[PDB]
Design a protein around this ligand. Sequence first.
Ligand SMILES: NC(=O)c1ccc(OCC2CCCC2)cc1
Lengths: 194, 197
Amino acid sequence: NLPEHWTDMNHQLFCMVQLEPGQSEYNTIKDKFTRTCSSYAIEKIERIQNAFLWQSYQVKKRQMDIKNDHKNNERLLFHGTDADSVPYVNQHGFNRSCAVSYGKGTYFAVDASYSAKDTYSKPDSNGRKHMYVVRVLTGVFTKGRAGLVTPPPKNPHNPTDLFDSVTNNTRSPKLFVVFFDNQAYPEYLITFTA
Amino acid sequence: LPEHWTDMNHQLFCMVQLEPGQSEYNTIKDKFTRTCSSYAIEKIERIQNAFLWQSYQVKKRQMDIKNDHKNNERLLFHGTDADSVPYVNQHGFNRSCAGKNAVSYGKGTYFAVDASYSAKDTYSKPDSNGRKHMYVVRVLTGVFTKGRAGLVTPPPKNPHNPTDLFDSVTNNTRSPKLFVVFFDNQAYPEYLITFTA
Ligand SMILES: NC(=O)c1ccc(OCC2CCCC2)cc1
């Protein structure tokens, strides 16, 4: 069930598609980034077409939509990473096993400006920085804390019925942490400079 | 969902107690007694977890596509403590919760070929009533190599293509006795064996 806005992959299961600047898709993703990163220069935006990651992610989304008994489980967030991690994330997505104040999960920022920090989007031996735009199944969330390996339970009387993610601040979240594979789909890769 | 599962009436999860004398019970008992003849089985439960099954079967279809005509799936054992059983039944095998193995071939979830390995008190810790717990697990071993203690994912097949990974690792490729998996939904807890001395 590969999305309509994907372009043909000649029967292959993975490709990185460079977006055409000035077209609707590129402009939408650039706007999300320039909301907080207008001083950064975008070299390119690539659409990540990873059939297997998409499949696994969409299954988790359908499950979370059933479990939570409503949609609105998905947020579009940012993830800065070093150039050496980009091939892995493109192919395999996010891996909690690869500061973790809110738990031992994968971190995503609400604002590109946070992911744009050199500590996350480390400039490569050419000044280029890399940030993903990520579909994240945040679902029902709670405040995180150091040392979590999964989200807390919604009620400790049922210790296996878990929150879907944690955040720094439930009323005004700026980051989300997920603890399971295939809760996040890297949808675009932005290559940019300071 | 498999057509021989009990009707769960829209419910997403059930444990089904098997009957001795049914082929399904007897095959698991025989697989267990092959190496654990000194222990006695209290009961065997079939684990019907719709979401874990769906996610696992997606991963299996993907590995079946990627590997072409490999037997990607092995039926293996996993001993665990009573405290972990409710979590595994609902959520499967989380590498983030895994103990360090006495012989480490990587930081992942360990599965044994022989029930005797999983039957060690270090894995199937007897509970306060002397009950030991072992899962029988469909594991996507895929294409595997000898692991190494440092691993947090399986190693690449080719050092010049670091993202094209083995599916799992083992202690010995010639004579595998354990497999380690490093990803969620690569192992489906199919049966829970409750047993005693
Ligand atoms: N890679 C990223 O984009 C990213 C990394 C870390 C992120 O929050 C880290 C928390 C904020 C302060 C304490 C820990 C968010 C995003």
